[PDB]
Amino acid sequence: KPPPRGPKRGTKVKILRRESYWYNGTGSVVTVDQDPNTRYPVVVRFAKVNYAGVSTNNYALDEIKEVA
Amino acid sequence: MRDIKTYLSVAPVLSTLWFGALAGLLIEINRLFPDALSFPFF
Amino acid sequence: KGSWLPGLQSPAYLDGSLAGDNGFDPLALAEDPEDLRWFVQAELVNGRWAMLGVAGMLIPEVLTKAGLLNAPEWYDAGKETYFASSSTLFVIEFILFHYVEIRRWQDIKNPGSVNQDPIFKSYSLPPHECGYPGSVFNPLNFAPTLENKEKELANGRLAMLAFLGFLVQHNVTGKGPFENLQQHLADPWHNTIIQTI
Amino acid sequence: EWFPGQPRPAHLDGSSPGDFGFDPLGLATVPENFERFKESEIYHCRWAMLCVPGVLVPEALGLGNWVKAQEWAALPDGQATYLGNPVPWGNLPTILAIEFLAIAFAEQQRTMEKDPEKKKYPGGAFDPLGFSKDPAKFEELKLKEIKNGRLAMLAFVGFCVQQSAYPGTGPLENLATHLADPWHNNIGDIVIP
Amino acid sequence: WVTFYWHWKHITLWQGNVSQFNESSTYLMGWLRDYLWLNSSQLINGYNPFGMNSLSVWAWMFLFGHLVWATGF
Amino acid sequence: AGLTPCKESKAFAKREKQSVKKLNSSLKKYAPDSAPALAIQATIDKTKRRFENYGKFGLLCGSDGLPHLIVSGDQRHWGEFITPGVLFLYIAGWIGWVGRSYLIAVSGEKKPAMREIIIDVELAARIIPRGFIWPVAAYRELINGDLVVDDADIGY
Numbered sequence: 001k002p003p004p005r006g007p008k009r010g011t012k013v014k015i016l017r018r019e020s021y022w023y024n025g026t027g028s029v030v031t032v033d034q035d036p037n038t039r040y041p042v043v044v045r046f047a048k049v050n051y052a053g054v055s056t057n058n059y060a061l062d063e064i065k066e067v068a
Numbered sequence: 069m070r071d072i073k074t075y076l077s078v079a080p081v082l083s084t085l086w087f088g089a090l091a092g093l094l095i096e097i098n099r100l101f102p103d104a105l106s107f108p109f110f
Numbered sequence: 111k112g113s114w115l116p117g118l119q120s121p122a123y124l125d126g127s128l129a130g131d132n133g134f135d136p137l138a139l140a141e142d143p144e145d146l147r148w149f150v151q152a153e154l155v156n157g158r159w160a161m162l163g164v165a166g167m168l169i170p171e172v173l174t175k176a177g178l179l180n181a182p183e184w185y186d187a188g189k190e191t192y193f194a195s196s197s198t199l200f201v202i203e204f205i206l207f208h209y210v211e212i213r214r215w216q217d218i219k220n221p222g223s224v225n226q227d228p229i230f231k232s233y234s235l236p237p238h239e240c241g242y243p244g245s246v247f248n249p250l251n252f253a254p255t256l257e258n259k260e261k262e263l264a265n266g267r268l269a270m271l272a273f274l275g276f277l278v279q280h281n282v283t284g285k286g287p288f289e290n291l292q293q294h295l296a297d298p299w300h301n302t303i304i305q306t307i
Numbered sequence: 308e309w310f311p312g313q314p315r316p317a318h319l320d321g322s323s324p325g326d327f328g329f330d331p332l333g334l335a336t337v338p339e340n341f342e343r344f345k346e347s348e349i350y351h352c353r354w355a356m357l358c359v360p361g362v363l364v365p366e367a368l369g370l371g372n373w374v375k376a377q378e379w380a381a382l383p384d385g386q387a388t389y390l391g392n393p394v395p396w397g398n399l400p401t402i403l404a405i406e407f408l409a410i411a412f413a414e415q416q417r418t419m420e421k422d423p424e425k426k427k428y429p430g431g432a433f434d435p436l437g438f439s440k441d442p443a444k445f446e447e448l449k450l451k452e453i454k455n456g457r458l459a460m461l462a463f464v465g466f467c468v469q470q471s472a473y474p475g476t477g478p479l480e481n482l483a484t485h486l487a488d489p490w491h492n493n494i495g496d497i498v499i500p
Numbered sequence: 501w502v503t504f505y506w507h508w509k510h511i512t513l514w515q516g517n518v519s520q521f522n523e524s525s526t527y528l529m530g531w532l533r534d535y536l537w538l539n540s541s542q543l544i545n546g547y548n549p550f551g552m553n554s555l556s557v558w559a560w561m562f563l564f565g566h567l568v569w570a571t572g573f
Numbered sequence: 574a575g576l577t578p579c580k581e582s583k584a585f586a587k588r589e590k591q592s593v594k595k596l597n598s599s600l601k602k603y604a605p606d607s608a609p610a611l612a613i614q615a616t617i618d619k620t621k622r623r624f625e626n627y628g629k630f631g632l633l634c635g636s637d638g639l640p641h642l643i644v645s646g647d648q649r650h651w652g653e654f655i656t657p658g659v660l661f662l663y664i665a666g667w668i669g670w671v672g673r674s675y676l677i678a679v680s681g682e683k684k685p686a687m688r689e690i691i692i693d694v695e696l697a698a699r700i701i702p703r704g705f706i707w708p709v710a711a712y713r714e715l716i717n718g719d720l721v722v723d724d725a726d727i728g729y
């Protein structure tokens with residue numbers, strides 16, 4: 001009943017953060033932790049792997065655009 | 069069988085055969101038109 | 111309709127609504143509808159002017175070789191001396207065509223816009239179908255029906271082909287194509303593309 | 308409209324004499340630029356309109372070439388001529404000085420006044436008879452001036468290109484020559500391509 | 501590169517044989533032969549087991565270059 | 574700039590003479606029928622007819638006996654740059670467009686890398702001959718703005 005933040009599922013997101021490899025990038029939400037003590041509760045998978053070999057990381061909601 | 073087809077579609081062998089064919093075409097043109105410097109058609 | 115390949119399925123691009131459909135696009139050029147329209151108009155104009163040109167090639171040649179007339183070859187008519195010099199008639203052609211063709215293009219971009227002769231307000235135009243203009247073009251009240259558009263397009267395609275043939279055969283020979291036909295009828299085996307190389 | 312079918316861009320809704328909707332480079336998107344262009348257009352057309360007969364009139368009647376009317380300046384002892392009248396002070400320095408002083412002084416005192424309508428259309432003491440009587444007639448003659456002046460500017464472009472392609476000639480001269488024989492005395496000899 | 505071009509052009513013009521430049525300056529081997537090989541023959545014989553010359557310093561200095569450079573590697 | 578065609582110059586004739594002369598002098602060290610000597614005479618007549626062909630197509634010719642291209646734009650000497658230039662431009666546009674179209678097509682799969690290393694030779698064969706469209710097709714693309722992108726940079 002308390003409205004869970006973050007997009008629902010599968011919503012392609014456009015990254016607003018500047019200091020990530022995927023600035024102006026199109027990723028996919030995989031889950032969002034409903035805990036209001038988090039500081040980066042959304043997590044996004046991509047189809048392009050970055051330099052460190054990783055393909056996932058965290059964000060807040062402000063650095064997201066729920067594109068579709 | 070299909071395995072050898074997918075293997076043959078791997079870029080090395082495809083590239084080798086393509087380049088061989090292109091080089092053959094070029095050397096045959098050079099044979100049939102020695103030294104071919106200008107465009108003496110128009 | 112008549113898929114020119116008794117086994118191949120026609121692509122969705124050429125359904126059969128437009129005249130002369132045979133699914134003849136083995137390279138999938140016009141798979142975008144607006145480009146299909148573009149090439150429809152281009153084929154129309156190319157075929158019409160190709161019919162014109164092939165007539166202007168063939169008929170003068172035979173009427174001259176018949177002794178009834180005397181007129182140079184279509185290629186031998188340039189250097190001929192007329193009442194007007196080349197450049198004069200050429201620039202008149204240029205201005206008149208830069209009027210007519212630009213009006214045609216404006217009609218292409220905008221269906222039913224440039225209709226009236228903007229000089230006088232009556233006498234102007236009945237609304238048309240794109241690629242098939244109205245009254246002042248079809249005075250004999252011919253009904254623009256099927257088997258007319260198909261015949262037009264088929265004759266025009268063959269005319270394009272025949273014109274390219276004229277051009278390349280003049281390139282390889284420089285002679286009158288009807289003379290090539292006479293030599294052909296002499297001996298089709300001794301007279302063909304093979305011997306002339 | 309000047310072009311049928313091509314819709315008029317936003318900032319050309321008629322609303323001004325001469326506006327037949329022609330702006331393919333979109334320079335008029337700026338209001339100040341637009342008014343400045345109108346003013347400069349009026350200046351241009353008005354100058355050229357005054358200054359075409361200053362070429363025609365001499366070229367035909369008792370004068371000579373429109374290029375030799377200034378030939379006095381190329382050589383030292385040149386003195387201008389009024390149809391066959393070398394005025395005592397028609398020398399180079401005095402006309403140069405009056406040009407400088409009059410043009411600069413006046414066009415300053417006139418431009419420095421920002422109505423802004425008076426700039427394009429002075430009036431004032433240049434309308435005491437009231438040829439501004441009829442507002443309909445007003446806009447009509449405005450349109451007329453714009454069109455005639457556009458034509459005059461075209462005419463000057465023609466003068467330039469013609470005197471270029473024909474070194475040392477006269478407009479009326481080339482016109483009479485070409486008309487004298489239609490299909491071989493024209494732009495053709497100039498431009499095959 | 502720029503100084504190579506200028507120096508070869510002038511060293512041909514001064515001997516009045518710009519023709520040689522114009523002929524054999526279009527193929528790299530021409531540069532390595534007509535410009536470097538030949539024009540260096542006065543230098544590398546600066547000092548030989550038969551004595552020395554005024555050019556000695558340069559020859560010496562020349563080799564010096566082809567050493568310090570190598571040390572950079 | 575004074576470059577006479579070697580249909581008329583002399584140093585060209587001198588080069589030709591010296592070349593055929595050294596070739597002929599080399600030729601007289603075998604049997605007059607030996608296949609190597611035969612190929613030598615073949616190359617002799619071949620370079621001869623080369624000199625002849627060069628003396629047939631308006632080749633302005635240097636002060637030292639060498640051809641020299643004239644790429645100044647005048648189509649009088651165009652059989653060197655203009656027509657071969659546009660021909661190669663046609664070929665390059667062919668290749669660029671066919672590659673771009675293949676990639677744009679195959680982008681829609683699970684991991685397009687597997688088809689970028691191992692080409693879809695069937696799709697490759699039914700995409701490849703489209704070269705005859707590369708001028709016009711791309712044209713319409715730019716008309717419809719479907720050739721470039723505005724603010725999509727990373728990811729896709």
Ligand code: CLA
Pocket residue numbers: 268271272274275276278279282283290291293294301302303304306
């Ligand atoms: C309307 C079409 C048409 C017609 C009637 C002709 C007719 C003729 N051509 Mg020709 N030609 C054409 C198109 C055509 N051509 C085209 C498009 C080209 C460019 C590829 C050529 C290139 C060409 C050359 C280079 C030569 C001829 C020659 C000839 C003549 C001898 C035939 C020959 O050597 O084979 C013709 C050779 C071709 C390559 C023609 C191919 C045409 C294609 C396949 C379409 C035609 C199919 C058509 C349905 C079948 C014929 C229709 C007819 C029975 C009504 C003959 C009068 C020769 C000549 O003048 O010597 C006497 C010759 O040297 N043609």
Ligand code: CLA
Pocket residue numbers: 668669670671672673675692697701
């Ligand atoms: C068809 C594919 C294709 C296309 C359309 C382009 C297009 C472009 N490249 Mg390019 N490139 C390609 C493949 C391609 N490239 C490949 C495979 C490589 C790695 C070798 C490069 C390496 C490369 C560099 C290093 C640079 C460009 C640049 C450019 C731009 C300017 C053109 C240029 O300088 O190229 C020059 C030509 C080449 C580099 C040759 C590469 C073309 C290859 C050989 C074709 C590949 C075809 C395909 C693999 C074979 C399969 C065929 C089919 C059956 C699937 C232009 C947007 C430049 C740029 O940034 O411009 C702003 C630049 O600096 N490219």
Ligand SMILES: CC(/C=C/C=C(C)/C=C/[C@@]12O[C@]1(C)C[C@@H](O)CC2(C)C)=C\C=C\C=C(C)\C=C\C=C(C)\C=C\[C@@]12O[C@]1(C)C[C@@H](O)CC2(C)C
Pocket residue numbers: 134135136137138139155156157159160162163164166167183184185187270271273274705
């Ligand atoms: C052949 C032709 C076009 C052929 C194109 C074809 C077949 C394309 C086929 C394809 O695209 C499809 C269908 C589907 C794709 O998947 C496959 C391919 C194969 C890619 C156009 C010719 C077009 C030919 C034309 C338009 C000729 C016009 C001739 C004129 C006007 C003659 C003028 C003169 O004769 C006069 C009038 C007087 C004389 O004195 C002087 C002159 C000037 C010589």
Ligand SMILES: CC1=C[C@H](O)CC(C)(C)[C@H]1/C=C/C(C)=C/C=C/C(C)=C/C=C/C=C(C)/C=C/C=C(C)/C=C/C1=C(C)C[C@H](O)CC1(C)C
Pocket residue numbers: 329330331332333334350351352354355357358359360361362373376377460461463464
């Ligand atoms: C009288 C006389 C005689 C004596 O003896 C001598 C003398 C002295 C020489 C004389 C004269 C003088 C004078 C006054 C002069 C002047 C003139 C002028 C002003 C001109 C202008 C002139 C001018 C002109 C034309 C102008 C033009 C312009 C134009 C086209 C433009 C256009 C455009 C526009 C709009 C816009 C769009 O978007 C674009 C464009 C397209 C860009």
